[PDB]
Amino acid sequence: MKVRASVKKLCRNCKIVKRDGVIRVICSAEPKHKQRQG
Amino acid sequence: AAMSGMLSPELKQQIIGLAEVRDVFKSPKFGAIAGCMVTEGVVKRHNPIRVLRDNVVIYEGELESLRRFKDDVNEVRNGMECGIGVKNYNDVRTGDVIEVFEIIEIQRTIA
Amino acid sequence: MFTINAEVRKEQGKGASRRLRAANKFPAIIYGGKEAPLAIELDHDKVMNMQAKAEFYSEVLTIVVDGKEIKVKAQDVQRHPYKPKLQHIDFVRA
Amino acid sequence: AKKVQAYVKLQVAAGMANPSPPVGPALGQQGVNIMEFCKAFNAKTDSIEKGLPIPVVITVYADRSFTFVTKTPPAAVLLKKAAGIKSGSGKPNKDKVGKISRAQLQEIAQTKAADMTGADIEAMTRSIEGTARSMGLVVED
Amino acid sequence: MLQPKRTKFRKMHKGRNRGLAQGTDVSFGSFGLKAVGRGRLTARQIEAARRAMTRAVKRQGKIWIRVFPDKPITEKPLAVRMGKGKGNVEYWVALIQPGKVLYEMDGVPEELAREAFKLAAAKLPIKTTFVTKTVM
Amino acid sequence: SRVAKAPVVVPAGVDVKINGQVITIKGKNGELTRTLNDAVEVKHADNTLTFGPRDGYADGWAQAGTARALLNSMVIGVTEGFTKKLQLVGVGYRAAVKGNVINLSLGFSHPVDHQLPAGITAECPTQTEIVLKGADKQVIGQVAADLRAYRRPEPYKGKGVRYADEVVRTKEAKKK
RNA sequence: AGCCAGGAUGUUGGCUUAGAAGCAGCCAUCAUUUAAAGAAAGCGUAAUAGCUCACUGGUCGAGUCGGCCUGCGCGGAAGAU
């Protein structure tokens, strides 16, 4: 998964969630859309 | 494998540094020394250069002598006063910019 | 048609005017004809919603102050530099 | 209009004899004989005249060869012989290109044996006109 | 790149970016981009944002440039002692205050106006916001 | 909020005994006893159970929706019982059961023996199929994840352990 | 927002076309039947596709959607005894 300061919803199948003290991007459709440290 | 090696491709012509020349000086050996100020990157000795004026290239060549003061250093960084001269270049005019670029080879594979 | 609630301003100068902006209000003036200039305070959030329509700056406005309906028209509006906000508006008796 | 499992339509023209380079084995992989395509197509279609290209459904599961019945051609193929120019697209919107009248492609559109959308005759008149004006023609109707 | 064709003088002092802006609204076009933050905009910065808005819209409508550098800014090169005159002008900048409209646009939808100015806004150093043509 | 507002219903034979925050649910197939968070208040009345918040808590309604969903899954768990069907795929993948332990061979150098905790019972009707069954929605999910944890499918072919409702989307092998 | 369905006709859309029947290409982006369905949304085929989506019916039955102003916080945030 990519990791970078800004995170954005790429496709409609992506979803923004909040785990611990870090924002993440969960995308079931495309695993390339996974992101950290949002 | 023998075939793949045979290939000689260099896919990079990225600029090493870009510099603008001002206040030309006269030299006996090269015929001219163009005072320069590097705005970006690092200027090197044996790396080829592209001399252009008003976005079109007036002249082309490879540096023979890179000399600042009497030091004659082989490398000059950006925003440091620099000096330049080359053979077979007759006319030095202010406002033009010289683009130096390194040459690298990507290499090739067969398929 | 446009009803705006208003009140007479007690104090004047920038000192009072800057205090009104922190309290979600802003200064104003009504002039024209034989009647003298009157200092007016208006609500920020109420006037901001009304001015969004194009009919605010064209049609005649009826300001209510101290139980008195005075008909005026909008002349000039000083908007805030960058934020979508207001500073002061000039009204004309008509 | 039934289900999946072998329902396909492709051709080059009705007048052709099914040669190899235009279609040949590139029609697909079925199991139905390509020689027998020149038997039941050449029972009905060749009987009078073969002007325009015609597609068709397969409908085969367990038994030997194709059991289908042929249907009508498209409306695009009617824009060449009985209308005007064959292709001449070029730049469709830079100029008027060509043209079709109200009487043209009226009696030709109703030559379809048995297939339509809706019972109204006035509805189907301008339904088949839909394939026209796709190439940037003018409407004089 | 935007720069003066001629000037009365070669160089200018540092000055300051104190005080507020003048042009609160878009006079020429319909929609535009306002400067929220306080700073300066170079010739390359002004050039870069103009390309991105034009690249998104392709070829339609019109773009007005309300700003312009006007101010020669010098720099001193490396391995040089302090003083010994003033440096040479590497680039031109504009003093931007809060309230300045930077760019404008007309003859397009409001949806694409947000997209073009958002891409242009990212190239800018200072914070910016969308603005609409207010009547009167 | 929207979940917790709905009353959950207990069928005939289901005894619900509430000593405190702990809730014992029993029925036909097994017996479970969870512990609530303490933020939620549960009320037993008639043939149903109802949930809601309590004063002096920030979370409030959001915890009541879980407390319903945990106790609702227990009602289906004790009476009906959940099922998790995990099929093996590919060459040299066989599954069997010997008592409480499941013996699985996922093409490894040694056989993998997985112990089933609690009262979870399983059976293999087909060699490539495994059918898990249990009265807890917590344990049947967790135990099913442990079987898939040994062999996670690579999506070039789709071999290995997968769930029945899961879909494995494969891709091409690129080019030389 | 879930769930049970439909997902079309001109039309396999003419086409500088080997092949195109929506897709990097071509162009307009018009036009029938219909509760509603685009010459158009896609993981993506040797071409049919297999499938799902915009849009719409039934089910369920009361709030729901995301811009604006603003307080205090979150990631961005890795240095050597």
PDB file of N, CA, C and O in Angstrom, chain C residues 9-72:
ATOM      1  N   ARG C   9     -27.757  52.884  16.442  1.00  0.00           N
ATOM      2  CA  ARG C   9     -26.429  52.669  17.027  1.00  0.00           C
ATOM      3  C   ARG C   9     -26.181  53.680  18.143  1.00  0.00           C
ATOM      4  O   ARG C   9     -26.363  54.885  17.944  1.00  0.00           O
ATOM      5  N   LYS C  10     -25.759  53.179  19.303  1.00  0.00           N
ATOM      6  CA  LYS C  10     -25.500  54.014  20.480  1.00  0.00           C
ATOM      7  C   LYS C  10     -24.166  54.753  20.352  1.00  0.00           C
ATOM      8  O   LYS C  10     -24.107  55.965  20.575  1.00  0.00           O
ATOM      9  N   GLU C  11     -23.113  54.013  19.993  1.00  0.00           N
ATOM     10  CA  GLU C  11     -21.760  54.557  19.799  1.00  0.00           C
ATOM     11  C   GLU C  11     -21.369  54.618  18.320  1.00  0.00           C
ATOM     12  O   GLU C  11     -22.032  54.021  17.465  1.00  0.00           O
ATOM     13  N   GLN C  12     -20.287  55.351  18.043  1.00  0.00           N
ATOM     14  CA  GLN C  12     -19.731  55.519  16.690  1.00  0.00           C
ATOM     15  C   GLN C  12     -18.214  55.276  16.680  1.00  0.00           C
ATOM     16  O   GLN C  12     -17.607  55.047  17.732  1.00  0.00           O
ATOM     17  N   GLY C  13     -17.620  55.323  15.486  1.00  0.00           N
ATOM     18  CA  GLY C  13     -16.190  55.069  15.289  1.00  0.00           C
ATOM     19  C   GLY C  13     -15.883  53.595  15.088  1.00  0.00           C
ATOM     20  O   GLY C  13     -16.748  52.737  15.292  1.00  0.00           O
ATOM     21  N   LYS C  14     -14.647  53.310  14.676  1.00  0.00           N
ATOM     22  CA  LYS C  14     -14.185  51.928  14.442  1.00  0.00           C
ATOM     23  C   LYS C  14     -14.164  51.042  15.693  1.00  0.00           C
ATOM     24  O   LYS C  14     -14.376  49.833  15.586  1.00  0.00           O
ATOM     25  N   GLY C  15     -13.885  51.642  16.855  1.00  0.00           N
ATOM     26  CA  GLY C  15     -13.872  50.934  18.141  1.00  0.00           C
ATOM     27  C   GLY C  15     -15.168  50.200  18.435  1.00  0.00           C
ATOM     28  O   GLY C  15     -15.149  49.021  18.786  1.00  0.00           O
ATOM     29  N   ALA C  16     -16.288  50.903  18.263  1.00  0.00           N
ATOM     30  CA  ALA C  16     -17.626  50.305  18.368  1.00  0.00           C
ATOM     31  C   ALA C  16     -17.931  49.345  17.214  1.00  0.00           C
ATOM     32  O   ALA C  16     -18.505  48.282  17.439  1.00  0.00           O
ATOM     33  N   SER C  17     -17.546  49.730  15.996  1.00  0.00           N
ATOM     34  CA  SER C  17     -17.800  48.931  14.783  1.00  0.00           C
ATOM     35  C   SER C  17     -17.113  47.562  14.792  1.00  0.00           C
ATOM     36  O   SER C  17     -17.713  46.567  14.377  1.00  0.00           O
ATOM     37  N   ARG C  18     -15.861  47.524  15.250  1.00  0.00           N
ATOM     38  CA  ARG C  18     -15.112  46.264  15.412  1.00  0.00           C
ATOM     39  C   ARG C  18     -15.684  45.359  16.517  1.00  0.00           C
ATOM     40  O   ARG C  18     -15.632  44.132  16.390  1.00  0.00           O
ATOM     41  N   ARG C  19     -16.204  45.961  17.592  1.00  0.00           N
ATOM     42  CA  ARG C  19     -16.933  45.218  18.642  1.00  0.00           C
ATOM     43  C   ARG C  19     -18.221  44.547  18.128  1.00  0.00           C
ATOM     44  O   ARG C  19     -18.564  43.451  18.579  1.00  0.00           O
ATOM     45  N   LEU C  20     -18.922  45.208  17.201  1.00  0.00           N
ATOM     46  CA  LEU C  20     -20.142  44.657  16.581  1.00  0.00           C
ATOM     47  C   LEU C  20     -19.887  43.434  15.685  1.00  0.00           C
ATOM     48  O   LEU C  20     -20.728  42.530  15.635  1.00  0.00           O
ATOM     49  N   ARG C  21     -18.749  43.410  14.986  1.00  0.00           N
ATOM     50  CA  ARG C  21     -18.364  42.267  14.131  1.00  0.00           C
ATOM     51  C   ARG C  21     -18.088  40.976  14.911  1.00  0.00           C
ATOM     52  O   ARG C  21     -18.413  39.886  14.435  1.00  0.00           O
ATOM     53  N   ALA C  22     -17.481  41.109  16.093  1.00  0.00           N
ATOM     54  CA  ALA C  22     -17.283  39.976  17.013  1.00  0.00           C
ATOM     55  C   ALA C  22     -18.597  39.411  17.579  1.00  0.00           C
ATOM     56  O   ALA C  22     -18.678  38.212  17.860  1.00  0.00           O
ATOM     57  N   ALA C  23     -19.611  40.272  17.731  1.00  0.00           N
ATOM     58  CA  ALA C  23     -20.948  39.883  18.217  1.00  0.00           C
ATOM     59  C   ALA C  23     -21.966  39.484  17.122  1.00  0.00           C
ATOM     60  O   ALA C  23     -23.170  39.442  17.403  1.00  0.00           O
ATOM     61  N   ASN C  24     -21.494  39.184  15.905  1.00  0.00           N
ATOM     62  CA  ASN C  24     -22.343  38.801  14.760  1.00  0.00           C
ATOM     63  C   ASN C  24     -23.325  39.911  14.314  1.00  0.00           C
ATOM     64  O   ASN C  24     -24.485  39.642  13.981  1.00  0.00           O
ATOM     65  N   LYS C  25     -22.830  41.152  14.310  1.00  0.00           N
ATOM     66  CA  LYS C  25     -23.573  42.339  13.850  1.00  0.00           C
ATOM     67  C   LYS C  25     -22.674  43.176  12.930  1.00  0.00           C
ATOM     68  O   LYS C  25     -21.498  42.847  12.748  1.00  0.00           O
ATOM     69  N   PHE C  26     -23.226  44.244  12.347  1.00  0.00           N
ATOM     70  CA  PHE C  26     -22.434  45.203  11.551  1.00  0.00           C
ATOM     71  C   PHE C  26     -23.123  46.573  11.399  1.00  0.00           C
ATOM     72  O   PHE C  26     -24.353  46.638  11.373  1.00  0.00           O
ATOM     73  N   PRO C  27     -22.331  47.668  11.282  1.00  0.00           N
ATOM     74  CA  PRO C  27     -22.900  49.019  11.149  1.00  0.00           C
ATOM     75  C   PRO C  27     -23.475  49.334   9.760  1.00  0.00           C
ATOM     76  O   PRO C  27     -23.166  48.648   8.784  1.00  0.00           O
ATOM     77  N   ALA C  28     -24.289  50.387   9.695  1.00  0.00           N
ATOM     78  CA  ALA C  28     -24.978  50.803   8.464  1.00  0.00           C
ATOM     79  C   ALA C  28     -25.461  52.261   8.547  1.00  0.00           C
ATOM     80  O   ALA C  28     -25.417  52.874   9.620  1.00  0.00           O
ATOM     81  N   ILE C  29     -25.914  52.798   7.410  1.00  0.00           N
ATOM     82  CA  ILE C  29     -26.378  54.195   7.297  1.00  0.00           C
ATOM     83  C   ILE C  29     -27.605  54.291   6.371  1.00  0.00           C
ATOM     84  O   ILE C  29     -27.674  53.591   5.356  1.00  0.00           O
ATOM     85  N   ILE C  30     -28.566  55.142   6.748  1.00  0.00           N
ATOM     86  CA  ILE C  30     -29.740  55.475   5.922  1.00  0.00           C
ATOM     87  C   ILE C  30     -29.742  56.993   5.722  1.00  0.00           C
ATOM     88  O   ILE C  30     -29.788  57.736   6.701  1.00  0.00           O
ATOM     89  N   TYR C  31     -29.710  57.432   4.460  1.00  0.00           N
ATOM     90  CA  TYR C  31     -29.667  58.860   4.097  1.00  0.00           C
ATOM     91  C   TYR C  31     -30.552  59.166   2.881  1.00  0.00           C
ATOM     92  O   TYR C  31     -31.141  58.258   2.290  1.00  0.00           O
ATOM     93  N   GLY C  32     -30.636  60.450   2.526  1.00  0.00           N
ATOM     94  CA  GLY C  32     -31.353  60.918   1.332  1.00  0.00           C
ATOM     95  C   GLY C  32     -32.592  61.719   1.688  1.00  0.00           C
ATOM     96  O   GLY C  32     -33.240  61.454   2.705  1.00  0.00           O
ATOM     97  N   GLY C  33     -32.921  62.693   0.839  1.00  0.00           N
ATOM     98  CA  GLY C  33     -34.046  63.599   1.074  1.00  0.00           C
ATOM     99  C   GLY C  33     -33.772  64.608   2.177  1.00  0.00           C
ATOM    100  O   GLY C  33     -32.613  64.873   2.516  1.00  0.00           O
ATOM    101  N   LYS C  34     -34.847  65.168   2.729  1.00  0.00           N
ATOM    102  CA  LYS C  34     -34.756  66.138   3.837  1.00  0.00           C
ATOM    103  C   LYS C  34     -34.330  65.534   5.188  1.00  0.00           C
ATOM    104  O   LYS C  34     -33.809  66.259   6.040  1.00  0.00           O
ATOM    105  N   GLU C  35     -34.551  64.228   5.378  1.00  0.00           N
ATOM    106  CA  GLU C  35     -34.230  63.549   6.644  1.00  0.00           C
ATOM    107  C   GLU C  35     -32.717  63.358   6.788  1.00  0.00           C
ATOM    108  O   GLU C  35     -32.035  63.027   5.814  1.00  0.00           O
ATOM    109  N   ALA C  36     -32.210  63.560   8.007  1.00  0.00           N
ATOM    110  CA  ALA C  36     -30.770  63.483   8.289  1.00  0.00           C
ATOM    111  C   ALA C  36     -30.271  62.027   8.321  1.00  0.00           C
ATOM    112  O   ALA C  36     -31.090  61.102   8.398  1.00  0.00           O
ATOM    113  N   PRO C  37     -28.933  61.814   8.249  1.00  0.00           N
ATOM    114  CA  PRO C  37     -28.382  60.452   8.364  1.00  0.00           C
ATOM    115  C   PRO C  37     -28.638  59.779   9.721  1.00  0.00           C
ATOM    116  O   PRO C  37     -28.469  60.421  10.762  1.00  0.00           O
ATOM    117  N   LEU C  38     -29.042  58.505   9.686  1.00  0.00           N
ATOM    118  CA  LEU C  38     -29.302  57.699  10.884  1.00  0.00           C
ATOM    119  C   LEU C  38     -28.346  56.506  10.913  1.00  0.00           C
ATOM    120  O   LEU C  38     -28.205  55.801   9.913  1.00  0.00           O
ATOM    121  N   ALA C  39     -27.704  56.289  12.063  1.00  0.00           N
ATOM    122  CA  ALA C  39     -26.767  55.177  12.259  1.00  0.00           C
ATOM    123  C   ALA C  39     -27.549  53.903  12.600  1.00  0.00           C
ATOM    124  O   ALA C  39     -28.397  53.928  13.495  1.00  0.00           O
ATOM    125  N   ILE C  40     -27.255  52.806  11.893  1.00  0.00           N
ATOM    126  CA  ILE C  40     -28.056  51.567  11.933  1.00  0.00           C
ATOM    127  C   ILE C  40     -27.164  50.341  12.169  1.00  0.00           C
ATOM    128  O   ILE C  40     -26.097  50.236  11.569  1.00  0.00           O
ATOM    129  N   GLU C  41     -27.621  49.422  13.029  1.00  0.00           N
ATOM    130  CA  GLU C  41     -26.972  48.115  13.240  1.00  0.00           C
ATOM    131  C   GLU C  41     -27.886  46.991  12.731  1.00  0.00           C
ATOM    132  O   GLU C  41     -29.093  47.006  12.997  1.00  0.00           O
ATOM    133  N   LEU C  42     -27.303  46.036  11.999  1.00  0.00           N
ATOM    134  CA  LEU C  42     -28.032  44.912  11.394  1.00  0.00           C
ATOM    135  C   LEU C  42     -27.361  43.579  11.719  1.00  0.00           C
ATOM    136  O   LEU C  42     -26.157  43.528  11.979  1.00  0.00           O
ATOM    137  N   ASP C  43     -28.154  42.506  11.677  1.00  0.00           N
ATOM    138  CA  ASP C  43     -27.674  41.152  11.974  1.00  0.00           C
ATOM    139  C   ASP C  43     -26.945  40.589  10.752  1.00  0.00           C
ATOM    140  O   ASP C  43     -27.449  40.684   9.630  1.00  0.00           O
ATOM    141  N   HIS C  44     -25.776  39.992  10.993  1.00  0.00           N
ATOM    142  CA  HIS C  44     -24.912  39.443   9.938  1.00  0.00           C
ATOM    143  C   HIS C  44     -25.573  38.274   9.209  1.00  0.00           C
ATOM    144  O   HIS C  44     -25.702  38.298   7.984  1.00  0.00           O
ATOM    145  N   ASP C  45     -25.994  37.270   9.977  1.00  0.00           N
ATOM    146  CA  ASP C  45     -26.588  36.037   9.431  1.00  0.00           C
ATOM    147  C   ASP C  45     -27.938  36.238   8.723  1.00  0.00           C
ATOM    148  O   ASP C  45     -28.257  35.488   7.796  1.00  0.00           O
ATOM    149  N   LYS C  46     -28.714  37.236   9.154  1.00  0.00           N
ATOM    150  CA  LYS C  46     -30.020  37.541   8.546  1.00  0.00           C
ATOM    151  C   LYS C  46     -29.863  38.234   7.190  1.00  0.00           C
ATOM    152  O   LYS C  46     -30.515  37.849   6.218  1.00  0.00           O
ATOM    153  N   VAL C  47     -28.998  39.249   7.139  1.00  0.00           N
ATOM    154  CA  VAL C  47     -28.732  40.017   5.908  1.00  0.00           C
ATOM    155  C   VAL C  47     -27.929  39.193   4.877  1.00  0.00           C
ATOM    156  O   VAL C  47     -28.145  39.351   3.672  1.00  0.00           O
ATOM    157  N   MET C  48     -27.024  38.327   5.349  1.00  0.00           N
ATOM    158  CA  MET C  48     -26.222  37.437   4.476  1.00  0.00           C
ATOM    159  C   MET C  48     -27.072  36.469   3.638  1.00  0.00           C
ATOM    160  O   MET C  48     -26.741  36.203   2.479  1.00  0.00           O
ATOM    161  N   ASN C  49     -28.143  35.937   4.230  1.00  0.00           N
ATOM    162  CA  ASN C  49     -29.082  35.057   3.515  1.00  0.00           C
ATOM    163  C   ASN C  49     -29.960  35.805   2.505  1.00  0.00           C
ATOM    164  O   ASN C  49     -30.257  35.272   1.432  1.00  0.00           O
ATOM    165  N   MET C  50     -30.375  37.024   2.856  1.00  0.00           N
ATOM    166  CA  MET C  50     -31.203  37.866   1.976  1.00  0.00           C
ATOM    167  C   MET C  50     -30.438  38.383   0.754  1.00  0.00           C
ATOM    168  O   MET C  50     -30.967  38.346  -0.359  1.00  0.00           O
ATOM    169  N   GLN C  51     -29.203  38.848   0.962  1.00  0.00           N
ATOM    170  CA  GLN C  51     -28.355  39.370  -0.132  1.00  0.00           C
ATOM    171  C   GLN C  51     -27.916  38.338  -1.186  1.00  0.00           C
ATOM    172  O   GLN C  51     -27.532  38.726  -2.294  1.00  0.00           O
ATOM    173  N   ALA C  52     -27.940  37.050  -0.827  1.00  0.00           N
ATOM    174  CA  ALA C  52     -27.679  35.942  -1.768  1.00  0.00           C
ATOM    175  C   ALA C  52     -28.576  35.974  -3.014  1.00  0.00           C
ATOM    176  O   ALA C  52     -28.123  35.639  -4.112  1.00  0.00           O
ATOM    177  N   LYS C  53     -29.836  36.377  -2.832  1.00  0.00           N
ATOM    178  CA  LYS C  53     -30.762  36.605  -3.947  1.00  0.00           C
ATOM    179  C   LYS C  53     -30.423  37.908  -4.678  1.00  0.00           C
ATOM    180  O   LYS C  53     -30.009  38.889  -4.050  1.00  0.00           O
ATOM    181  N   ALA C  54     -30.608  37.908  -5.998  1.00  0.00           N
ATOM    182  CA  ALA C  54     -30.393  39.102  -6.834  1.00  0.00           C
ATOM    183  C   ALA C  54     -31.455  40.197  -6.638  1.00  0.00           C
ATOM    184  O   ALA C  54     -31.193  41.366  -6.938  1.00  0.00           O
ATOM    185  N   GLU C  55     -32.639  39.823  -6.140  1.00  0.00           N
ATOM    186  CA  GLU C  55     -33.732  40.776  -5.871  1.00  0.00           C
ATOM    187  C   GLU C  55     -33.488  41.719  -4.672  1.00  0.00           C
ATOM    188  O   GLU C  55     -34.191  42.724  -4.535  1.00  0.00           O
ATOM    189  N   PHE C  56     -32.520  41.384  -3.809  1.00  0.00           N
ATOM    190  CA  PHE C  56     -32.118  42.230  -2.669  1.00  0.00           C
ATOM    191  C   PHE C  56     -31.569  43.590  -3.115  1.00  0.00           C
ATOM    192  O   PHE C  56     -32.011  44.630  -2.621  1.00  0.00           O
ATOM    193  N   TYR C  57     -30.619  43.571  -4.050  1.00  0.00           N
ATOM    194  CA  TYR C  57     -29.983  44.800  -4.553  1.00  0.00           C
ATOM    195  C   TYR C  57     -30.800  45.591  -5.595  1.00  0.00           C
ATOM    196  O   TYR C  57     -30.462  46.747  -5.869  1.00  0.00           O
ATOM    197  N   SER C  58     -31.856  44.991  -6.161  1.00  0.00           N
ATOM    198  CA  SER C  58     -32.702  45.650  -7.175  1.00  0.00           C
ATOM    199  C   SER C  58     -33.949  46.300  -6.566  1.00  0.00           C
ATOM    200  O   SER C  58     -34.167  47.504  -6.726  1.00  0.00           O
ATOM    201  N   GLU C  59     -34.755  45.495  -5.870  1.00  0.00           N
ATOM    202  CA  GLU C  59     -36.043  45.945  -5.311  1.00  0.00           C
ATOM    203  C   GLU C  59     -35.876  46.815  -4.060  1.00  0.00           C
ATOM    204  O   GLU C  59     -34.789  46.884  -3.480  1.00  0.00           O
ATOM    205  N   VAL C  60     -36.970  47.467  -3.659  1.00  0.00           N
ATOM    206  CA  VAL C  60     -36.989  48.377  -2.503  1.00  0.00           C
ATOM    207  C   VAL C  60     -37.113  47.564  -1.206  1.00  0.00           C
ATOM    208  O   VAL C  60     -37.885  46.601  -1.144  1.00  0.00           O
ATOM    209  N   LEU C  61     -36.358  47.974  -0.181  1.00  0.00           N
ATOM    210  CA  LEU C  61     -36.271  47.279   1.117  1.00  0.00           C
ATOM    211  C   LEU C  61     -36.936  48.109   2.219  1.00  0.00           C
ATOM    212  O   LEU C  61     -36.718  49.319   2.292  1.00  0.00           O
ATOM    213  N   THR C  62     -37.718  47.445   3.077  1.00  0.00           N
ATOM    214  CA  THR C  62     -38.423  48.083   4.198  1.00  0.00           C
ATOM    215  C   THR C  62     -37.750  47.737   5.533  1.00  0.00           C
ATOM    216  O   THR C  62     -37.976  46.653   6.082  1.00  0.00           O
ATOM    217  N   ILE C  63     -36.926  48.658   6.041  1.00  0.00           N
ATOM    218  CA  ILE C  63     -36.221  48.473   7.320  1.00  0.00           C
ATOM    219  C   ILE C  63     -37.151  48.849   8.480  1.00  0.00           C
ATOM    220  O   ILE C  63     -37.758  49.923   8.468  1.00  0.00           O
ATOM    221  N   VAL C  64     -37.237  47.958   9.474  1.00  0.00           N
ATOM    222  CA  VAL C  64     -38.022  48.169  10.696  1.00  0.00           C
ATOM    223  C   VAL C  64     -37.059  48.541  11.830  1.00  0.00           C
ATOM    224  O   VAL C  64     -36.172  47.750  12.165  1.00  0.00           O
ATOM    225  N   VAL C  65     -37.233  49.739  12.398  1.00  0.00           N
ATOM    226  CA  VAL C  65     -36.430  50.215  13.540  1.00  0.00           C
ATOM    227  C   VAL C  65     -37.290  51.052  14.502  1.00  0.00           C
ATOM    228  O   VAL C  65     -37.936  52.015  14.084  1.00  0.00           O
ATOM    229  N   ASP C  66     -37.301  50.654  15.781  1.00  0.00           N
ATOM    230  CA  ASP C  66     -38.096  51.304  16.843  1.00  0.00           C
ATOM    231  C   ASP C  66     -39.610  51.389  16.541  1.00  0.00           C
ATOM    232  O   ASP C  66     -40.291  52.316  16.993  1.00  0.00           O
ATOM    233  N   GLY C  67     -40.126  50.410  15.793  1.00  0.00           N
ATOM    234  CA  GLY C  67     -41.506  50.427  15.306  1.00  0.00           C
ATOM    235  C   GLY C  67     -41.750  51.494  14.250  1.00  0.00           C
ATOM    236  O   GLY C  67     -42.659  52.316  14.394  1.00  0.00           O
ATOM    237  N   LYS C  68     -40.928  51.478  13.197  1.00  0.00           N
ATOM    238  CA  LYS C  68     -41.035  52.428  12.077  1.00  0.00           C
ATOM    239  C   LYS C  68     -40.534  51.798  10.771  1.00  0.00           C
ATOM    240  O   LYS C  68     -39.356  51.447  10.665  1.00  0.00           O
ATOM    241  N   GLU C  69     -41.430  51.674   9.787  1.00  0.00           N
ATOM    242  CA  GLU C  69     -41.107  51.106   8.471  1.00  0.00           C
ATOM    243  C   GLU C  69     -40.646  52.204   7.506  1.00  0.00           C
ATOM    244  O   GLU C  69     -41.465  53.000   7.036  1.00  0.00           O
ATOM    245  N   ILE C  70     -39.338  52.244   7.232  1.00  0.00           N
ATOM    246  CA  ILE C  70     -38.733  53.201   6.293  1.00  0.00           C
ATOM    247  C   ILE C  70     -38.310  52.444   5.031  1.00  0.00           C
ATOM    248  O   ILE C  70     -37.558  51.469   5.117  1.00  0.00           O
ATOM    249  N   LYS C  71     -38.790  52.904   3.873  1.00  0.00           N
ATOM    250  CA  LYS C  71     -38.447  52.309   2.575  1.00  0.00           C
ATOM    251  C   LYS C  71     -37.101  52.848   2.093  1.00  0.00           C
ATOM    252  O   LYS C  71     -36.938  54.066   1.974  1.00  0.00           O
ATOM    253  N   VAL C  72     -36.146  51.947   1.834  1.00  0.00           N
ATOM    254  CA  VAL C  72     -34.824  52.304   1.289  1.00  0.00           C
ATOM    255  C   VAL C  72     -34.372  51.353   0.174  1.00  0.00           C
ATOM    256  O   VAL C  72     -34.893  50.242   0.050  1.00  0.00           O
TER     257      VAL C  72
END
